[PDB]
Design a protein around this ligand. Structure first.
Ligand SMILES: Nc1ncnc2c1ncn2[C@@H]1O[C@H](COP(=O)(O)OP(=O)(O)OP(O)(O)=S)[C@@H](O)[C@H]1O
Ligand SMILES: Nc1ncnc2c1ncn2[C@@H]1O[C@H](COP(=O)(O)OP(=O)(O)OP(O)(O)=S)[C@@H](O)[C@H]1O
Ligand SMILES: [Cs+]
Ligand SMILES: [Cs+]
Ligand SMILES: [Cs+]
Ligand SMILES: [Cs+]
Ligand SMILES: [Cs+]
Ligand SMILES: [Cs+]
Ligand SMILES: [Cs+]
Ligand SMILES: [Cs+]
Ligand SMILES: [Mg+2]
Ligand SMILES: [Mg+2]
Lengths: 412, 434
């Protein structure tokens, strides 16, 4: 029996929470044809207790906390006392929703709040599967939003004015957001093998050729710009079950994680793919550059390095022979843990449009080391094959050589 | 005694020979511990270079300058009986001199024209330490002990001093601590059962240990215990371990207590130097003293979650005093231990008739059931900040209650208001058995 949860900090926004819940319930019943239940959850972190919300099934603040036990997610330091309280409630909310999602029918979640409440809701909401309606009327929807939404389908409705009581403005904003949510909920209730590919502008020739091949081979494709969030976006989709195979052509995010660039991946890169045990064909695309921008920003120690000014906002740094071995180490240390087929394809000529004969980043000395270092580090991996092809990553034959390698570890 | 004689190498040395305008382009080599030790020595050479150089600067253009001829001060110094200073001869030469005194002041010489002293030359600790440390080198290379070093990363009231007092064998071991008040507290708590087991020989301040090394007492210790070792330079810790001749050393540290500070204009003390290299790292995250609310506070300032064995939950409160005068023993008695942040306020409270008053800094490591914290200075007080070690210490001394009386709004008032607002059900999550 479908159920949705209206969540908010009742100790500071009780009437707004009520008004929203009331409007959601009303809209759900209205838009359907058929019964969706609504539960109001209080995530207040102060001692002020709220025991009810009109006639709604209601969950008090203490009940959310009681299902949770302090974990690693909140062990670090915090700016202030309130930030910590919110961090703990947030994770407690996540546990509360996990439970409701397993032994229950979670049809959708909606909430409201300022930066604090939004921060609290976003974290728990994006932990739910893509597809499930997630909505937050936020006073910080207009501004930097990635720390709230991440790679999810979380929707932040701008509150327009600060959330402080029901007035002619909030009345309309809350009514619209609640109706939108109800629509998503009722609409969902009343209703090919895809390959993921990593890309950079400097490897787009390769990626486009690979994509045309794959579509011709009958696959569905999802291309991700290797900007740090890209790889993460791809991997979250892998554990979400939306991607059955990966052609990680552009692993450039590793360079930034190692050297300390702006579009870095985190220490978890590749884990999602290996844990799912889905076919993986990996390469060294654009591993010749670490992202910065602008020059004035380029950390002091790298100021003497070979820099290429792409734009006024982005400057690329050419990776050194010594750094490439470190890239190999990171990739290898992950791949050697594989428990399923993996193929590493390496382009002997170059790893990007800038790493080619007659280009600003061309350095076959670094490429060669990257190549010999992967071979060596992967030499005893009984699950990984290493292919060294006499081409440049952007050569048409390399692209088709990538899909060939994919087809052999994922026959069709 | 023979101390002044042990520092002969520094007596009458030219000011110039001890001044090093650089110590920024220094490159270290060898094992990490070796660089830390070398760097520690250098930090000392640097501090002395600055002290000597400032004295010379004053003579050419706190800081006291004596006219040798009239035996009268041209610029009287704040302190008295300075251990040393720089001498300016009639030919205008500058020398470092170990000072001697008598009924009429500094005992001088015929060729001395003027003498300069300062707060830096009040004590000859840097020289004393430099003397001791260089004697332990074989061509600038320090010896690294093979002794096992265990670091215990703790938090307020988790049992740092308690464990030391419980595990130490006073007949064989040594306990080293940063300040005199710490040492006296340790010796007092060890001797509280009636017998003196903790003396000036098995419990010493780091400065005393370094300055009077070999001078006597006892040298060989089975185990070394350092209370609050993150208050020390890493090289200093490597030295103490080796100098104690211990087989194992236990360094108890707290990442939020006042840390080791450079205090030498752009002196090189990189990040990797500031990290103590040890064989084992143990963590303590259960405070056995602090109430739940203060525990919440500790959770936001420390890496890792902090739990508490205490049943106390809400324990802090504050009060803005309209009239600073109203804060007197008759008008309003302050219960428990009365503390302040500054020496001035402390004097004020004492002059008003309040008994047994101390500053937060003077009661580090101490425990009290109830605390009355007072701020009388409406003017800016540096050490009272939301991230200040003093605020941290001031909030973690009590087991029962704390109350802050202040004449003006400040970060502590916010922190306390915040802690008072926290959900009680959230506070319960920090509780642990025992
Ligand atoms: N010191 C505190 N300790 C614990 N919880 C607190 C504290 N201060 C505030 N809260 C709670 O934090 C939650 C959010 O407070 P809000 O005023 O709603 O912040 P917000 O409007 O969502 O976002 P901002 O940062 O204020 S714009 C409420 O449940 C407050 O009661
Ligand atoms: N005289 C005493 N009587 C009873 N209990 C005490 C006494 N002194 C200290 N304690 C308890 O011992 C624990 C503190 O151990 P300590 O080692 O002194 O604190 P700490 O770990 O050193 O942290 P610091 O130095 O105060 S920040 C707390 O639970 C105190 O309540
Ligand atoms: Cs209907
Ligand atoms: Cs309908
Ligand atoms: Cs629990
Ligand atoms: Cs990059
Ligand atoms: Cs292999
Ligand atoms: Cs001498
Ligand atoms: Cs010199
Ligand atoms: Cs008192
Ligand atoms: Mg923490
Ligand atoms: Mg202590």
């Amino acid at each position: 029996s479908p159920r949705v949860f209206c969540i908010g900090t009742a100790d500071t926004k009780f009437d707004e929470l009520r008004f929203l819940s009331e409007h959601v319930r009303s809209s759900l019943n209205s838009f359907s044809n058929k019964k969706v239940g609504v539960t109001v959850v209080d995530v207040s972190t102060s001692w002020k207790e709220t025991n009810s919300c009109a006639d709604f099934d209601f969950v008090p603040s203490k009940d959310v906390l009681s299902c949770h036990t302090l974990g690693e997610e909140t062990m670090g330091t915090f700016a202030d006392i309130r930030g910590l309280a919110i961090a703990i409630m947030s994770k407690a909310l996540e546990t509360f929703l996990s439970i409701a999602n397993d032994e229950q029918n979670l049809a959708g979640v909606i909430g409201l709040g300022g930066s604090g409440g939004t921060s609290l809701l976003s974290s728990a909401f994006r932990s739910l599967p893509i597809g499930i309606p997630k909505v937050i009327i936020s006073t910080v929807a207009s501004g930097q939003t990635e720390s709230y939404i991440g790679t999810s389908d979380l929707v932040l409705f701008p509150s327009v004015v600060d959330i402080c009581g029901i007035n002619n403005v909030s009345k309309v904003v809350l009514s619209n957001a609640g109706a939108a949510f109800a629509g998503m909920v009722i609409g969902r209730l009343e209703s090919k093998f895809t390959v993921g590919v990593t890309m950079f502008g400097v490897t787009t020739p390769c990626v486009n050729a690979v994509k045309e091949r794959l579509v011709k081979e009958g696959y569905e494709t999802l291309v991700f710009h290797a900007t740090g969030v890209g790889g993460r976006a791809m991997e979250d989709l892998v554990r979400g079950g939306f991607i059955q195979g990966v052609l990680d052509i552009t692993t450039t995010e590793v360079a930034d994680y190692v050297v300390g660039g702006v579009m870095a991946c985190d220490s978890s890169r590749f884990d999602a793919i290996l844990e799912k045990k889905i076919p993986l064909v990996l390469s060294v695309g654009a591993l010749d550059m670490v992202n910065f921008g602008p020059k004035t920003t380029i950390p002091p120690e790298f100021q003497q390095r070979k820099i290429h000014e792409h734009n006024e906002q982005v400057s690329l740094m050419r990776t050194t022979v010594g750094e490439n071995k470190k890239f190999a180490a990171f990739i290898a240390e992950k791949l050697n843990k594989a428990s399923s087929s993996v193929c590493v394809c390496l382009p002997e000529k170059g790893v990007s449009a800038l790493d080619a004969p007659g280009k600003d980043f061309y350095d076959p000395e670094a490429t060669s080391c990257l190549t010999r270092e992967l071979q060596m580090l992967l030499e005893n991996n009984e699950r990984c094959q290493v292919k060294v092809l006499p081409y440049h990553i952007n050569d048409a034959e390399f692209a088709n050589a990538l899909v060939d390698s994919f087809l052999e570890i994922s026959p069709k | 005694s023979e101390e002044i004689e042990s520092l002969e190498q520094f007596h009458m040395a030219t000011a110039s020979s001890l001044i090093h305008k650089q110590m920024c382009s220094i490159v270290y080599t060898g094992p990490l511990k070796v660089q830390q030790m070398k760097n520690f020595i250098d930090s000392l050479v640097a501090s002395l270079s600055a002290a000597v150089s400032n004295l010379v600067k004053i003579l050419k253009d706190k800081f006291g300058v004596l006219d040798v001829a009239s035996k009268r001060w041209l610029v009287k110094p704040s302190a008295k009986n300075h251990a040393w200073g720089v001498v300016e001869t009639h030919a205008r030469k500058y020398h470092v001199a170990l000072l001697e005194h008598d009924e009429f002041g500094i005992i001088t010489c015929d060729n001395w024209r003027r003498v300069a002293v300062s707060s830096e030359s009040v004590v000859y600790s840097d020289m004393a330490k430099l003397r001791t440390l260089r004697r332990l080198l074989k061509d600038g290379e320090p010896h690294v002990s093979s002794a096992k070093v265990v670091l215990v990363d703790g938090v307020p009231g988790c049992g740092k001093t308690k464990e030391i007092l419980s595990r130490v064998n006073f007949e064989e071991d040594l306990i080293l601590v940063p300040g005199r008040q710490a040492a006296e507290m340790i010796r007092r708590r060890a001797n509280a059962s009636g017998i003196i087991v903790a003396t000036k020989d098995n419990v010493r301040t780091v400065d005393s240990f370094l300055m009077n090394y070999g001078k006597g007492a006892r040298c060989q210790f089975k185990r070394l215990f350092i209370d609050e070792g993150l208050m020390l330079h890493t090289g200093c810790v490597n030295f103490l371990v080796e100098m104690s001749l211990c087989d194992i050393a236990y360094v108890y540290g707290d990442t939020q207590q006042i840390p080791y500070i450079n205090r030498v204009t752009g002196f090189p003390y990189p990040a990797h130097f500031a990290k103590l290299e040890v064989d084992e790292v143990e963590t303590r995250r259960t405070t056995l003293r602090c109430p739940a609310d203060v525990t919440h506070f500790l959770n936001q300032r420390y890496e890792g979650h902090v739990m508490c064995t205490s049943s106390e939950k809400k324990s802090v409160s504050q009060e803005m005093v309209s009239g600073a005068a109203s804060i007197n023993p008759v008008s309003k008695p302050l219960k428990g231990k009365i503390l302040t942040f500054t020496q001035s306020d402390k004097e004020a409270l004492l002059s008003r008739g309040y008994a047994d008053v101390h500053t937060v800094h003077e009661v580090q490591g101490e425990t009290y059931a109830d605390v009355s914290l007072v701020r009388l200075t409406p003017t800016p007080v540096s050490i009272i900040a939301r991230d200040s070690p003093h605020v941290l210490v001031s909030l973690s001394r009590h087991t029962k209650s704390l109350k802050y009386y202040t004449v003006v709004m400040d970060p502590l008032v916010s922190i306390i208001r915040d802690l008072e607002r926290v959900s009680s059900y959230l506070l319960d999550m920090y509780k642990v058995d025992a």
